[PDB]
Paper text:
Addition of fluorines on the 4-position of the cyclohexyl ring in 5 was tolerated and led to excellent metabolic stability, both in mouse and human liver microsomes. The complex of 5 bound to PfKRS1 showed that the addition of the difluoro moiety on the cyclohexyl ring had minimal effect upon the position of the ligand within the binding site with respect to 4, and there was no evidence of protein rearrangement. In this complex, all polar interactions were retained, although the H-bond between the bridge-head OH and the side chain of Glu-500 had shortened to 3.0 Å. Compound 5 was active against both PfKRS1 (IC50 = 0.015 μM) and whole-cell bloodstream P. falciparum 3D7 (EC50 = 0.27 μM) and was selective compared with both the HsKRS (IC50 = 1.8 μM) and HepG2 cells (EC50 = 49 μM). Under our experimental conditions, results showed a linear competitive inhibition vs. ATP with a Ki of 32 nM and a linear uncompetitive inhibition vs. l-lysine with a Ki of 212 nM. These results indicate that compound 5 competes with ATP for the same binding site and only binds in the presence of l-lysine, also suggesting a sequential ordered kinetic mechanism where l-lysine is the first substrate to bind. Molecular dynamics (MD) simulations were successful in reproducing the binding pose and interactions of compound 5 observed in the co-crystal structure of PfKRS1. In addition to those interactions, the inhibitor was found to be stabilized by hydrophobic contacts established between the cyclohexyl moiety and the bound substrate l-lysine. Simulations performed in the absence of l-lysine showed a notable destabilization of compound 5, suggesting a key role of l-lysine in the binding of PfKRS1 inhibitors. In apo-PfKRS1, due to the smaller size of V328 and S344 side chains, the ligand binding pocket remained accessible to compound 5.
Residue numbers in the entry:
A (entry chain A): 78 to 282, 287 to 518, 535 to 582
B (entry chain B): 78 to 144, 147 to 518, 537 to 582
Write the structure that this text describes.
Amino acid sequence: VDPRLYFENRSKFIQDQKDKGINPYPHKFERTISIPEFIEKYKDLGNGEHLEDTILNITGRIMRVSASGQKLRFFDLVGDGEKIQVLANYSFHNHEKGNFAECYDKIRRGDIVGIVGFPGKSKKGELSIFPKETILLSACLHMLPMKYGLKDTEIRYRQRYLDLLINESSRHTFVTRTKIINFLRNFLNERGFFEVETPMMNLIAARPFITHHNDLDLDLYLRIATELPLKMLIVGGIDKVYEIGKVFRNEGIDNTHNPEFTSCEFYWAYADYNDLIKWSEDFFSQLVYHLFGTYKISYNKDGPENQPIEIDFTPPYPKVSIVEEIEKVTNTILEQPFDSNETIEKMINIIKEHKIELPNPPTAAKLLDQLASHFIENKYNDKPFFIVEHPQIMSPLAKYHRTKPGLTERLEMFICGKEVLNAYTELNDPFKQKECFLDSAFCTSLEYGLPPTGGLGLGIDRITMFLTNKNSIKDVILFPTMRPA
Amino acid sequence: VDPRLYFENRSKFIQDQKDKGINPYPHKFERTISIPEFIEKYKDLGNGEHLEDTILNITGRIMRVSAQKLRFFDLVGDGEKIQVLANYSFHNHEKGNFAECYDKIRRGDIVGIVGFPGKSKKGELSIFPKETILLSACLHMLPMKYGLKDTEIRYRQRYLDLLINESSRHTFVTRTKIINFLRNFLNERGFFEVETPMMNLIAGGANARPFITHHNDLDLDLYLRIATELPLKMLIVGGIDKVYEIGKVFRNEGIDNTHNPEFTSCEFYWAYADYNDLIKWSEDFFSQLVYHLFGTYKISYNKDGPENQPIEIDFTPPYPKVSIVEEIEKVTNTILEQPFDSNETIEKMINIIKEHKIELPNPPTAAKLLDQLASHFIENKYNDKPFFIVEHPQIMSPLAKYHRTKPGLTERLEMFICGKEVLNAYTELNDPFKQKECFSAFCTSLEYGLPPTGGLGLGIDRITMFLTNKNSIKDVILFPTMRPA
Ligand SMILES: O=C(NCC1(O)CCC(F)(F)CC1)c1cc(=O)c2cc(F)ccc2o1
Ligand SMILES: O=C(NCC1(O)CCC(F)(F)CC1)c1cc(=O)c2cc(F)ccc2o1
């Protein structure tokens, strides 16, 4: 091919057109209808039917060019993810506005054009615009990749625009993401929740990103969660409150982790465990039904080259008590307290015998996390499920379980072995909140009285992955965090 | 009453309750109605009328303790208020001693009441308890009725502002309604909401130092975005023809009453739109937003603070359009000959600034001089209606398409409310051969073909300030970043 030459020559064309008094980047073309609107309005035409008296102005990007016949030229025109044909017939051209062949020979794949013409269908039944006049609105100076010729993630994740133009499923993925967020926002708002914005950077502060604030001469931390200020709003009497926005984790990158991701966190005064579980079941089932018209979906867990599985979002979903289950499968009691030297040693021994990676550092909470990932988190690939009743030492903001000492009223929901949701009743007794005696501001706010409250957070990117059949978070974030090329 | 001793005694109370087998922070109280729903259901009851057969569970925060045999409180929830009338006559004596129960209650305590609806003889809608449970105690003395004018406290303990100042909750409810109105306005027009990166590889801009941070695993310096403009334009190239984002942008600069280093913007791009379409979108949005909130286009604003008379701002469209160079030349009795960056015109501008005893921008570039002249001579032109400043010079507007009829100018508009910029918009300069930056990821995307496009940005915080009658931007941000205590 030689793309460099293609580009040099198209740049010369631009200059050339300008020499003839043609602006290949003109100011304004007044369109009368969009491509989706045109398809909706004309899709019932009969084969070969022309509405020669209906004159429309339309725009779009040319994505295919062909001819045979100097006097009959055909293009694909795309707009808003939809497509029509352009049938340029010598006889329908306005010859006073220019030479036909000259007008149409200069069009290349990628060009954005403005068409004045009439609607009809080809004898084959393809919905088409029949131009009297076609003008360039903006040129494509590069050779675009061919359809099915853009697989390189280095280009798709950086030059996302090329991915959107060439890979049809890419636009669908990002459409689905926005419909998920719209669904959630509406779901919450119909339940009386009040959306807010809290600060993206905090004084005191998951390993954080740090940034210097010039006006205050302070080094501040990007938020890792929106939890603290939301709870302060509950204290303030906003009894159902939430935020949907970005949080930042200066950690690793992989198929389920990006350094900024979008969370939805809500707090719900006077709610319990049971309300959070029901919320979760209601929300997931109703979202999937909204998107798909069924509770069951297909997901390629092990990639596009292997057979998919079915994930069923029909509620209710299984609940697995983390400690009881670890103890059962390992036939070992993890005696409380879980951070005793003896119980730590026991967890390390189990980890050592199953050749599970020892975490670093090997703290009781991280040991319990590793045990759960090994023995439980992959238990159910065919339905979402909750891991519940986590130890206090894993869950310092969660209220004590009312009948299982040492545990909490916490739930964490997993889809195919990946965490997408964490929720719990908030520990609201300041004399039991060990992290006070945590941002000193939080501690203080508890002393003014936090009602009994339930809190919940969702990972919007991971949810989108499952509902768009993607195996990497990079495929559901328009511009994922990447080093320069 | 001494605040330290008050707190110490409430802490001692908590522990004494626990020592008597009472949990002053119980897990769950199951409420059956909210305070707003209660007011709505029972507001028509005849005086002194009781529905003693309707047993309800209600919760709220006690905000007044009036009150033997008969105890009176104010109970608040969701920004509304009812009376509590606790009568010995109706108390469930099985559950506890009437005076022991009600003697323990203090202003700010959150409580759960089992009781019945009625009005008092005197006419006051009330809940009548049979039983009252502490759900979460206020350990501190709450500031009273007024007496929380202190901005430090309102901004550092926003929860106290929200509990004590009725107008606080209103300000922030209004803010959420503005954003909701905007999202819906856009969505009904076919715009598609996206999230672009908070962290990018662009080291700020000409008038905006960046927040800098660093991802440790990548070993990569990153910068907080100063605007969403670049990725949104790339999505226009990618065929998302009407695209927007509402979220935070970051400029690591000084703080004042109209500038916060983190602030909320909405930016949209609209392919195939012009100048005039952006003017009209602006008049439609502002007028309809104000009508939506107030039921009139005319609002009152204390431009000179609460201690001075307000002015009326009329949002009835259309709004005035003032051409920047023409108006400077008129008010200043000068002619500013192009090019505006000639030593002569620079000299003329510098001398106007000196002679008027206006601070001279440093360095004195043509764009900065023009900026200073507009700010002094034109940005206060109208205070009784919003207005547009239009047709900025190319030299001040390097991403704006050239004006079709006036040499050296652009298709740009900025809207001002009481001398403050709330919107900036223009037709995008899309010929890469005319974009001065293209001697970049921008310039590469322009080479693939950006259609003729209109772009617009709104300052959400400043718009909220005017629609909530605030003079400082910290008044419309829940938790603004403050110099630590
Ligand atoms: O969705 C995710 N996690 C699930 C949640 O923990 C998310 C927060 C919650 F919504 F509150 C509860 C459920 C997630 C996505 C990432 O890209 C990511 C990146 C990191 F560097 C570190 C953690 C990360 O976590
Ligand atoms: O609302 C503001 N400006 C108006 C806009 O320029 C906002 C960006 C646009 F929306 F795209 C077009 C209109 C504003 C608010 C601040 O708090 C602020 C702080 C700074 F450090 C620097 C500039 C700032 O500007």
